[PDB]
Amino acid sequence: LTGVQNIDGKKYYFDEQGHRRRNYAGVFNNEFIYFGLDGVGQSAIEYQFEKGLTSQNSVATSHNAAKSYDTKSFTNVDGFLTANSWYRPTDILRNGTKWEPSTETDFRPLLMTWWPDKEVQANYLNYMSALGLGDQKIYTGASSQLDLNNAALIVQEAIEKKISLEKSTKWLDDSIKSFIKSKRKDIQGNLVDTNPGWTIDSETGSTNHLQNGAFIFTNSPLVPEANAAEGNRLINRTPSQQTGNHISYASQPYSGDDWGYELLLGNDVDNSNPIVQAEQLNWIHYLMNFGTITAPQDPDAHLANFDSIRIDAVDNVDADLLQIAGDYFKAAYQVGENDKNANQHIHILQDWSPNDVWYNQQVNGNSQLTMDATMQNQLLASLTRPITSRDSMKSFTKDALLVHRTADNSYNQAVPNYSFIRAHDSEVQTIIAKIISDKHPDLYPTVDKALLAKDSALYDEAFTEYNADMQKISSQKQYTHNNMPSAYAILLTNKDTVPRVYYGDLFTDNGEYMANKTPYYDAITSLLTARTKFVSGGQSLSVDKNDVLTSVRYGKGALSATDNGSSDTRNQGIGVIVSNNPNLDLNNDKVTLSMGISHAHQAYRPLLLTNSQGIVAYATDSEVPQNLYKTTNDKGELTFDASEIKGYDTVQTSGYLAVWVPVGASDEQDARTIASTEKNNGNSVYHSNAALDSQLIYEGFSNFQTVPSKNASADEYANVIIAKHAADFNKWGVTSFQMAPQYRSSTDGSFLDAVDTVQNGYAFTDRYDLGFNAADGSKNPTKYGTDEDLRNAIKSLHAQKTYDGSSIQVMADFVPDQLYNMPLEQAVSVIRTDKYGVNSENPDIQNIIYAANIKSSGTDYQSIYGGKYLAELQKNPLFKSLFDRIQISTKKTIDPNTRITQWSAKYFNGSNIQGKGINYVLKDWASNKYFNVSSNDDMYSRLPKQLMNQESNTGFIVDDIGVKYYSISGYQAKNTFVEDGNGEWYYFDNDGYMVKSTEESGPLRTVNASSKKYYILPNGVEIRNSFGQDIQGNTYYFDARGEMVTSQYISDDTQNIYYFNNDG
Ligand SMILES: OC[C@H]1O[C@H](OC[C@H]2O[C@H](OC[C@H]3O[C@H](OC[C@H]4O[C@H](O)[C@H](O)[C@@H](O)[C@@H]4O)[C@H](O)[C@@H](O)[C@@H]3O)[C@H](O)[C@@H](O)[C@@H]2O)[C@H](O)[C@@H](O)[C@@H]1O
Ligand SMILES: [Ca+2]
Structure with a gap:
């Protein structure tokens, strides 16, 4: 059988291949039929939407209308509203039995009296019913507008009685927030998010980020205060790519690859912004003077200053910072003059990319020491690997090593470098995560997946194995x-x-x-x-x-x-x-x-x-x-x-x-050599020689150090233990003590560093807070100690003296890359991307408005110290070259004239995906504009008309001319798509009328001068995931967005393939 067939009083279409079809439209025997998913024909003439309007005006809409339209009566983000907006109505239905004027504190959740469409209204009603407040009736998006409204009144009565009983509304913030993120069972039988547009489920795009997703912040005219300057938000300026293009600095045996990417973790700081570059300099100056700045009444405050810095995440930030820092130490401590001054301030790079070694040497001028990764990797492969995987010892004489030591017989030849075997990160975390994996395949079966887990009980378990394996003989080391x-x-x-x-x-x-x-x-x-x-x-x-x-x-x-x-x-x-x-x-x-x-x-x-x-x-x-x-x-x-x-x-x-x-x-014999005082003409600040080899760094921490409990005794805190043991480090030959980052940690668990069991200090909100006492004056430490306990650790290390009579240096962890867990929301325009900033090409999330946690408190230590010393430093002659330097990536100078006291979205490249949901910022679907309460500009939609006690109607209305639609908010559809509760899409033109195909102008239609072609039936139904037949007999396919497919092969449910050429 082929063509149209009636099987049991139901029309079916069989193609010319004899196959029964689903989602197929066409004129057959002079009748326009749409074979829906069923495979069953529906009449493409008969309207599918309930005709008519219902008024959203009730007896109660005069009372539940907002008292003040201005911001005073609405919680808001830069004037915008979210699903967690609360507002002040004119009247409160007090205890469910009387209307009384609202006071200044009588706020209620917006979601009690308004919803963005009927399906959310329906789901809200059933959810409040689950808590006993709502009716047994189980309303759905299919049920009528009028029934949903009346049920919300029955819910409102119940809410108000509960509020009068508690004398509190806190329980309602709790229950509405839980509703917004609620899950439910479905027809498939799987749990799904009830409200996808308000969860991370809607934030779909590339998974190539440590946190499974990223946004780039971009400018948009809707949000004036989050927009950056032109020529800012430079991305991926690694040392190799600092210029704008990859440059291999490496020669014949060595690699010149770059492994960097801008968006690493957290909220990503725009280090290509010259005002930010100045605030990075200000922070380095603050660390290098931490003692004198924080304890001015202490006469020994000058002994509690940091001496050197390690640059963190070099591959993830604008490489301009390496020069900014290298200039500071020349200006402040004259490190460019000779080995003696250079070797008193030993900085290190976390430069993992092979090219960075050679970038550092040729462009950087060695202001910081590169790592020898070739030595680390060879020590690991040749000895630490179990017998199966182990390289020969002969590999230590190979050509690819950075420093050939088979015949090394001279000074000032080798590239200045630090070498190591393990790090707080490197070769520690990965081993634990593999143990988690090998014990719990049900939770994390692949090794990479095991890394990500934050459960305190999972670490405790993995570590008792790790510790036990370390005690085992080398033939039975499964992980160590x-x-x-x-x-x-x-x-x-x-x-x-x-x-x-x-x-x-x-x-x-x-x-x-x-x-x-x-x-x-x-x-x-x-x-x-x-x-x-x-x-x-x-x-x-x-x-x-x-x-x-x-x-x-x-x-x-x-x-x-x-x-x-x-x-x-x-x-x-x-x-x-x-x-x-x-x-x-x-x-x-x-x-x-x-x-x-x-x-x-x-x-x-x-x-x-x-x-x-x-x-x-x-x-x-x-x-x-x-x-x-x-x-x-x-x-x-x-x-x-x-x-x-x-x-x-x-x-x-x-x-x-x-x-x-x-x-x-x-016993007097010391093999070390004193630094040269002779003037240095060379590009490099350090030189690989006897005086530099006399140095040794000690990385004085671990991630997994237990965190002193709330009422810990004074001597559990690591910085106190450091002070006790100061002489032990000197005995070991330590000349540079690399401390942990001392910044107050986040406890939110966006990452492993942010876990409360191991608050290491790389995840912070307030860079200037190294553990200052609380507002009441109570001692309030970091993981490692208070500000007092830190200043004293630094003094104890400074009191120790090495072979040349100088103090043991103290190194600050300089972390310019990111900030975590910021307190205030801001509106921002976002694009969904991967970690490199590449557009993940999601249509729904392009230049949309998101309520990002991206604004600092403005009462933090950032607000006190931020840009504070830039005024002072500009006036110093020694710093002139730093402030006059043309930076490589920006092609401009540093900009020390603006102070950063409150971080704002305009100073960030982007952010990880925060799981608020795309549609968390509220919006009228008919006008397609966002609500905004601080502004009466035409680019924003006015409040839903009910909330301002105006006439408001919703639904479809047939008219002598055509069909119009009004949203739940009461505004008319113009130049948008609109989805009906039935599941069908329609489009409304500029005149505010539904588009319907006609006999003279067939179903295949451009609509928005966008060169995009859709298929619209005489119903006004715009078909999606479907085939459309022409009056001539040509066949087209329309994707999930309804758009005609071109130069492309479409695969079918039954594995049938149709490949449609360009335009047809
Ligand atoms: O402030 C944030 C963090 O700062 C420090 O970490 C910064 C770096 O983190 C990662 O580097 C760690 C990683 O580096 C190498 O990984 C090797 C990989 O290199 C390529 O991709 C290669 O193709 C892969 O095969 C290979 O696995 C080390 O060898 C490995 O041991 C380390 O784990 C980023 O990747 C870097 O770009 C960052 O600069 C600090 O340690 C963190 O705790 C902080 O959160
Ligand atoms: Ca960055």
Whole structure:
């Protein structure tokens, strides 16, 4: 059978293929039929909407009309209304039994007396009915307007009685907010959001962001105060892309890739805005003078200042900031003059992209130290990986390493760098999340998915496993790093690098600060003090035929194996042996430590050695038994037998580790070198040399440190423990103490940093608040301590003095990228995007108005200190070059003339998706304009006419000329689409009349001079997800938006494909 058929008094269409069709329109045997989803024909002549209007004027609309139309009587966001708007009516139905004038505090939720369409009204009624206040009747969007209105009166009676009983409306804010986010069962049987336009479910777009979605803020004439200047909101200005275009600075062996992207986390700060760039400078000046600024009455306030900064998230922010900072330290502390001044202020980059190393060198001029990621990645791959996945030791002599150490024999050649093995983030968090995954596949089956979980009970569980696996032998380490002391032994003996030690190597990553040691503490703290006494001179790496790494330092004064050295050489210069093979069987093969010829016929003793029991550590010459002493031959070589070196499997080593030092060193002996005072002509601020290698960084925190409970004793707080243990860090050779960010944390759980169990300080609302006491004067700390406790930690570290007589530096975590959890809402124009700022191309969310949490309180410490010192600094001659500098990305100078005391949306690139819902800002569907109460401009819609006690009618009205529609608010449809409760779409033209196709002008129609073609029946029904037949017999398809498809193949329900060409 083909064509039109009556099967059981019902019309069906069978195509020319014989297939029964659904969602097909056409003129068949001179009759216009629409085969709906059923596959059943409906008459495309007969109107499908209930004809008629109902007045929204009631006996009660005179009373429930707003007393004042002005902002006073409406809660609002910059004049706009949201679903959580409350308003003051003229009268209150007090206790459900009398109309009384409203007082100044008699506000009620807008949603008690007005809804944006009938379906929301229906759902509200059934929900308030679930709480016992509403009627049993179960009204739907299908039920009549008049019934819904009367039911809202019965609900209102019940609300008012409850309010009179409580003498409070707080319970109603609670219940309406819960209604707005409510879920319900459906026909499918799955839970769905009741009100999708008011939840994250409507915020659909790209998932490529840490928080599953992003907005870019853009300008729009509806919102004057959130609009940025022209040439601001620059995106993705990484060091590689700072100019506007990617630039590889890398040469033949090395990569010049960029892994950056602007929108990382939170609310994204526009660091391309010159006023923001000035406020970033002001914040650095505040940190570098924190003591003198916060405790002016303390005579020692000048000892409680920070000395250096680490730049955080370098790949995510405008790279102009690196120059701004590098200028400040030249202006303030003359770091450009010589190594002596440079090395007193050691800054570091979190520069993960391979190109950044070379950007830093060529453009940056080394104002901050790059990380050696090639060293980190190689130490991990060759030793820490379990046996299956492990690289050969021979990889340490490869070409792709940043600093070749096989033949390093000179100063001022290597790129100045810091190298490390682990970070608060790097190689800690990922391991925990994998444990969560391997224990709970039901919640997070893929490893990446496990990262994101915030449950306190999930971390506690994952950590008892993590801690237990760290105690296991290397062959049974399922998650923890193997060979950790072997890695630290290479790192701490290497030349031309500033090593950084992670807190969580020495201590447990979780629990009380400094309270529990790792299995590695003895090995690593031995190496740290030994570095101070022996590690100096040139270096060489080798690997013998058995893959045994031998790293040698020749001692101060000697730069190669054939160098005779100075008087300092003899008792300096360590040698290290590492194997990564648990079954190493040397047999007849010999391992050789070739110390220098400067070290011929010389007694050596062990610092570290591997047993089956673990690693033995000898702290002095006299702790070594005399048979373990070994003397070098005439060439300066030590030789080892299978009786000494074999494969091991302990907690601390897969393979072998040994460290040998020359006998007879004094206790006065320090291997470190004083910084040069000679003037530096070079582009770089730092130089890789003996004085710089004398430095060492200690990352003094972990994410998963337990957070001192509300009534914690004074000595749980980490900054107090730091002050106690100040001498221990100096003993370890620490010259730069990298503290945690000290900023008051968010507790909201938008991210892992924002979790109340681990409030690390990277998630903050008020950058200037380092734990100042509360308003009442009660002590109110951060995770680490009060402002007092911080100032005292800084003084204790400053009181410690290193080998050159200078203080131990204290480093601030400089975090310019984002702000979290801002208190006030602002209207903003948004586009849905991914993390790169690429338009996710959602039609519904293009330049729409959103109520974003994006405005600071204006009573915070930002409001006190923000831009405060820019007036002072501009007047200082030393800072002239900073303020006159043309920045790379902006091509303008910094703008210190405006102060930022309240953050506003105009200073942000964008934000993560906040889950308010697209239609959270309220809007009349007929006029398609937003409500605004602060303005009577024509771009905004006036209040719904009922609320201003005017005549108001809603529904469809047939007329001698055509069909008009009025919304629930009482306004006429003009130049919009309108969905009926039946599910059908219609369109209304400029004249305010429904578009209907005619015999003379067929169903395929452009409507809005938009070049977009739709299919409209004689009903006025605009068909969607459907096929449309022409009078000529041509067939077109119309997508989910109703738009005609062109040059494209459409797939069908039954897997049938039709490919429609351009225009037809
Ligand atoms: O202030 C916000 C945060 O600041 C710090 O973190 C900043 C950086 O966070 C991430 O970097 C961590 C990540 O870096 C490397 O990831 C390697 C990946 O590189 C590519 O994409 C590659 O193609 C991938 O295969 C590979 O996985 C490290 O090796 C890894 O260990 C680290 O986890 C961002 O990605 C960076 O762009 C940011 O600059 C601070 O640590 C955070 O806690 C703060 O919240
Ligand atoms: Ca940014």
